[PDB]
Amino acid sequence: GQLVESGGGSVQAGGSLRLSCAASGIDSSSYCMGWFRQRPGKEREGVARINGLGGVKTAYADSVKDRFTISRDNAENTVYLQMNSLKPEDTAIYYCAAKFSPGYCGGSWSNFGYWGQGTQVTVSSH
């Protein structure tokens, strides 16, 4: 079980970035997959999650609802975070994560077990 984020970069307020999370070892279509972030000098917090067992339902932190979309491409064993309407406040290291076992997320950010190394997302204003 290994997760690797890519797609990070340094963009301008109002813009978009699409992060990818490539899973290895585990089959991400089976697992509750999530994105978390650690904003500068802040503790890690949940951002989005999508059910396992081939589910399509998702949940979001209030701060990102309607701006960010998590999705999974089961044929690529890859999870995406489409980040639109970016704000400087979204600047953070973003981490991909999976719960320990195939199944549904169960309505919580708890019990995430596999973590990527993270990818930097910087959003700047004038």
Partner: peptide, 6 residues
């Protein structure tokens, strides 16, 4: 398909 909320 009765998937629970995530």
């Amino acid at each position: 398909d009765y998937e629970p909320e995530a």
